[PDB]
Amino acid sequence: KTTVRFWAMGKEAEVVAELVADFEKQNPTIHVDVQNIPMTAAHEKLLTAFAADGLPDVCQLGNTWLPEFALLDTLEPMQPYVARSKIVDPADYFPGVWDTNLVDGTLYGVPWYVDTRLLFYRKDLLREAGYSQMPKTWAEMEQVMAAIKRKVGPDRYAILMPLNEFEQQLSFALQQDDRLLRDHDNYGNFRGAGFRKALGFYDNMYQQGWAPKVSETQVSNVWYEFFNGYYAFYLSGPWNVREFKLRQPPGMEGNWGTAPLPGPNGLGAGIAGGSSLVIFKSSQHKDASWKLIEYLSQPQVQARFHAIIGDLPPRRSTWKLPSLANDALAHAFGDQLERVKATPKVLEWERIVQEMRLVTERVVRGGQSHDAAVQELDQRVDEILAKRRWIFEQEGG
Numbered sequence: 001k002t003t004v005r006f007w008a009m010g011k012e013a014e015v016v017a018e019l020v021a022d023f024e025k026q027n028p029t030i031h032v033d034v035q036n037i038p039m040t041a042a043h044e045k046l047l048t049a050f051a052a053d054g055l056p057d058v059c060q061l062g063n064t065w066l067p068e069f070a071l072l073d074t075l076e077p078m079q080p081y082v083a084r085s086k087i088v089d090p091a092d093y094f095p096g097v098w099d100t101n102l103v104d105g106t107l108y109g110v111p112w113y114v115d116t117r118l119l120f121y122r123k124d125l126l127r128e129a130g131y132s133q134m135p136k137t138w139a140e141m142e143q144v145m146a147a148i149k150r151k152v153g154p155d156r157y158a159i160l161m162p163l164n165e166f167e168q169q170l171s172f173a174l175q176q177d178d179r180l181l182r183d184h185d186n187y188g189n190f191r192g193a194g195f196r197k198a199l200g201f202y203d204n205m206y207q208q209g210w211a212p213k214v215s216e217t218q219v220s221n222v223w224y225e226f227f228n229g230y231y232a233f234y235l236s237g238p239w240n241v242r243e244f245k246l247r248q249p250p251g252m253e254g255n256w257g258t259a260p261l262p263g264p265n266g267l268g269a270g271i272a273g274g275s276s277l278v279i280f281k282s283s284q285h286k287d288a289s290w291k292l293i294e295y296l297s298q299p300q301v302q303a304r305f306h307a308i309i310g311d312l313p314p315r316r317s318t319w320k321l322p323s324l325a326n327d328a329l330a331h332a333f334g335d336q337l338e339r340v341k342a343t344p345k346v347l348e349w350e351r352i353v354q355e356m357r358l359v360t361e362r363v364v365r366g367g368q369s370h371d372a373a374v375q376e377l378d379q380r381v382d383e384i385l386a387k388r389r390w391i392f393e394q395e396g397g
Contacts, residue, residue: 001029001030001031002029002030002031002285002288003031003032003033003285004030004031004032004033004057004058004285004288004289004292005033005035005056005057005058006020006032006033006034006035006056006057006058006059006060006292007034007035007037007042007045007046007056007058007059007060008034008035008036008037008059008060009036009037009038009039009042009060009275010036010038010039011309012060012113012275012309012311013034013035013036013037013060014036015305015308015309016034016060016296016305017034017036018308019296019301019304019305020032020034020292023292023295026295027291027295030288030291030292032292035056039062043065046059046069050072050074053282055074055280055282055283056280056283057279057280057283057284057285057286057288057289058277058278058279058280058283058289058292058293059277059278059279059280060112060275060276060277061109061275061276061277061278062274062275063100063101063109063111063272063273063274063275063276063342064100064273064343064349064350066100066101066103066108066109066276066278066345067103067345067346067347067349068347069108069278070103070104070106070108071103071347073281074280074281074282075108075109075278075279075280075281076108076278076279076280076281076283076286077106077107077108078101078107078108078109078110078278078279079106079107081279081290081293081294082107082110085290085294085297087294087297087298088110088293088294088297092315092316092317093111093314093315093316094114094272094314094315094316094337094338094340096269096272096337096339096340096341096342097111097114097272097274097314097337097340098111098314099272099341099342100272100276100342100345101276102345103345104345108278109276109277109278110276110277110278110293110297111274111275111276111314111315112274112275112276112277112296112311112314113274113275113302113305113306113311113312113313113314114272114273114274114311114312114313114314114337114340115237115238115271115273115274115311115312116237116238116270116271116272116273116274116312116333116336116337116340117167117168117171117235117236117237117261117270117271117273118235118236118258118259118260118261118270118332118333118336119134119159119233119234119235119258119259119260119261119332120226120233120234120235120236120240120244120256120257120258121134121232121233121234121256121257121258121259122226122227122229122232122233122255122256123254123255123256123257124255125148125151125152125229125232126144126148126232128151129144129147129148129150129151129232130147131144131147134259134262135262136260136262136263136266136267137262137263137264137265137266138201138262138263138264140262141262142204142210144158145158145159145205145208145210145233146158146208146210148210148232149208149209149210152229152232154209156229156230156231157209157210157211157212157230157231157232158205158210158211158231158232158233159205159210159211159231159232159233159234159235160211160212160214160219160222160225160226160230160231160233160234160235161202161205161211161235162214162215162216162218162219163206163213163214163215163360163361163364163365164215164216164217164357164361165216165357166353166354166356166357166360167235167237167271167273168202168235169198169199169202169356169357169360170271170343170353170356171235171261171269171270171271172198172201172202172261173194173195173198173199174269174270174271174340174341174343175198175261175263175264175268175269175270176193176194176195176197176198176264177194178192178193178194178195179192179194179344180192180194180195180343180344180352181344181346181352181381181385184392184397185344185345185346185385185388186385186388186389186392187378187381187382187385187389188352188377188378188379188380188381188382188385189378190356190374190377190378190381191374191375191377191378195374196370196374197264199360199363199370199373199374200370202360203360203363203364203370206364207364211231212231213364213365222234222236222240223240223243223244223246223247224247226244226256227244227247227248227249227252227256235261237273238310238311238312238333239309239310241258241310241329241330242310244256257328257329257332258329258330258331258332258333259332260332260333260335260336260339261336263339267335267336267339268339269339269340269341270336270339270340270341271340271341271343272340272341272342272343274311274312274314277293277296279293297315299313299315299317299318299320299321300318300321302314302315302318303318303321303323303324306318306323306324306330307323312330312333312334312337314337319334319337346385346388347388348384348385348388351384352381352384355377355380355381355384356377359373359376359377359380360373
């Protein structure tokens, strides 16, 4: 009888619609209307629906979108619901993942699934270069890559990291002790030691010839090139597990795997990407809405979600279910999730990483200096943050 409107994006919308079928058949007084909105139009449709007073009750939100919708005061504080929920226990959620839903100390969402990036690797190629263990430190990673490069020759590579993507540089920058922004997140901190170290490590891989100097469009097919041996490692996310499985050529079952991202001193941090679920505060049925989110927070529902679409559960107890715990390819993700870190929670974060990536591709391709790069990046970021910084100077903060 009670209808809840739930907006979700793309493949996730399709899959979650199957799941709600069982939620409805467990809660017959509740109807869930699932709308599939394309991601490329989602941000406009929402800002638009906002102004027009037509927001759904429940909504999937990319977790870098939270700070914006929170500071627009559209999001229902979630802590009161979490506190009264047996099912949703914050201590069971990976801390870096939970942290992405906190804006200014206030909880505005519940993590739904996690996207993080780590190494897919050819086991056979790793063994041919001499190794049975994947590297866990940066220095070990460099030696392994050099060892593969000797083996494969001038026309083949150790690792693929497309220069048009920002997630790789970002992952390595998140492994540093300092923050990418500074002073109340009002200024860029790309001139800081951490970003300089990350830029150095990342640029070095292309200049040594370990990673090809290409954009994703310049690669024919990431899965076939991988199985063709054009490169031994591919730094990427959970959706690839299925894709590689499908294209795994006959003799190749079990000759590839996933490994968590090496860090400076050991296995390191990575990105806490993915989506959260929120309740818009204009909703009339918040309690029905909460029940839906709680359902999608049940370990067994999350396992099912992972099984179908590959999206990583955001909580430890889902990872303990045999479905996940015995998945040899999932293990590396589950381990890395213990270390993922949230990016600075500013509305202008997406613009910022776009600048970062433009500058780094120039460093890699054009040989722009690292000093010039980080100085220039900070200048661009300081402009991007100008309105935020000004508001801070004018009020209290």
